[PDB]
Design a protein around this ligand. Structure first.
Ligand SMILES: [Zn+2]
Length: 403
């Protein structure tokens, strides 16, 4: 399509805009300086020419060039947009700004509100920390806290973003023109699309309540839980570099592995892996290690997810935690490096079936022939069938499910 704001963003170079305000030192391909928004001793505020964003490793504030100006000048995102449009000789009529654009800006402003709120609340902050999440990871992932509906509503109204935000359904209305934050009182975990745009939130409750321990934004135009993976934006460069991804069950397992420097990690949004999520993962990698809880249900969840991964053409390597351990407890007892080793020592699905079918030929043949049926590569399919046939003498027509 065609929009003033998108055209403005394309024309701006974040390096030129921030350099007007700050003394930027070139460090590698990036620039760094001391943060103007929080106070620390050592320059922690980075500007990436290649990503066209800034990010403070000290307080976690981050965003594009317009957003920097908004924060520096204490004005709204679109107010900052207008100021930059004048500097660049680009048009921007604030009346032509689509609601659509405002939704994303609202999502992002609400993310900043929650982040600030987490820093200010001692119980929430200590909670997150007490759970083994590193403060550096908490900041990278823009973790927050929802302290007040009225506080949130005030920032929305002040920024002229309330009506846009209402399209997300992250706000309830119990009575006319009064609002309650869906995530009230929860530690907030922003959900980003694969390009890093905040599209919604998960919320983990930290108080005793009748409500679910975890909730997500409801599905909508902007947010589809079944089509996104938590951590993909943060993980994708590590996944590419390492040549595989690690799939864990939920956000807390992911945040923990990232806290321990294991960064090529994704998790299903909210729940069980979906086919769309397996398809999406396959666009970044063709090898996935699955690391679910070391109990029955975890093992059963790995078995449900494997055919979705196979169908998407990924090679699967199940990682078996010892009985009773989730990733968090395993890391606490044995250390991050042992988890890396466990993951590495884990055999590929079919190679492991072939190796262990000896245990229970009957049950293991069942599994093998079942998983085999999700391989779209017939050449590979056949070689796997041949190996099993050769080894255990099970007829090719049993293995290929020929009726
Ligand atoms: Zn900062």
């Amino acid at each position: 399509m065609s929009s003033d704001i998108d055209e403005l963003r394309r024309e701006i170079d974040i390096v030129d805009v921030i350099s007007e305000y700050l003394n930027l030192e070139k460090v590698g391909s990036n620039y760094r300086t001391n943060c103007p928004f929080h106070p620390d001793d050592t320059p922690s505020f980075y500007v990436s020419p290649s990503k066209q964003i800034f990010k403070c490793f000290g307080c976690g504030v981050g965003g594009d060039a317009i957003k920097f100006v908004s924060l520096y000048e204490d004005i709204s995102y679109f107010e900052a947009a207008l100021e930059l449009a004048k500097r660049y000789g680009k048009k921007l009529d604030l009346e032509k700004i689509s609601k659509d654009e405002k939704v994303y800006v609202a999502l992002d402003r609400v993310c900043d509100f929650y982040r600030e709120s987490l820093l200010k609340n001692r119980e929430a902050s200590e909670y997150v920390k007490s759970r083994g999440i590193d403060p550096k990871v908490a900041r990278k992932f823009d973790l927050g806290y929802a302290p007040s509906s009225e506080a949130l509503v005030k920032v929305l109204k002040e920024n002229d973003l309330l009506e846009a935000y209402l399209e997300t359904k992250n706000l309830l209305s119990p009575t006319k023109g009064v609002y309650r934050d869906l995530f009230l009182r929860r530690v907030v975990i922003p959900i980003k699309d694969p390009r890093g745009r905040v599209i919604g939130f998960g919320g983990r409750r930290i108080v005793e309540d009748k409500s679910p321990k975890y909730i997500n934004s409801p599905d909508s135009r902007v947010f589809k839980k079944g089509e996104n993976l938590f951590g993909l934006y943060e993980a994708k460069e590590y996944i590419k570099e390492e040549g595989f991804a690690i799939l864990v069950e939920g956000y807390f397992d992911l945040l923990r592995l990232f806290s321990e420097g294991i960064r090529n990690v994704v998790a299903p949004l909210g729940t069980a892996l979906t086919q769309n999520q397996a398809n999406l993962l396959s666009k970044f990698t063709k090898k996935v290690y699955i690391l679910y809880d070391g109990d029955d249900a975890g093992r059963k969840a790995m078995k449900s997810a494997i055919p979705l991964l196979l169908s998407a053409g990924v090679e699967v390597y199940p990682v078996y935690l010892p009985e009773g351990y989730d990733p968090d407890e395993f890391i606490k007892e044995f250390g991050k490096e042992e988890l890396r080793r466990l993951i590495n020592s884990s055999g590929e699905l079919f190679e492991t079936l072939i190796k262990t079918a000896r245990e229970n030929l009957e049950e293991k043949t069942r599994e093998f022939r079942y998983y085999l049926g999700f391989i779209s590569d017939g050449v590979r399919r056949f070689a796997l069938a041949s190996e099993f046939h050769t080894k255990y003498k099970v007829p090719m027509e049993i293995l290929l499910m020929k009726i």
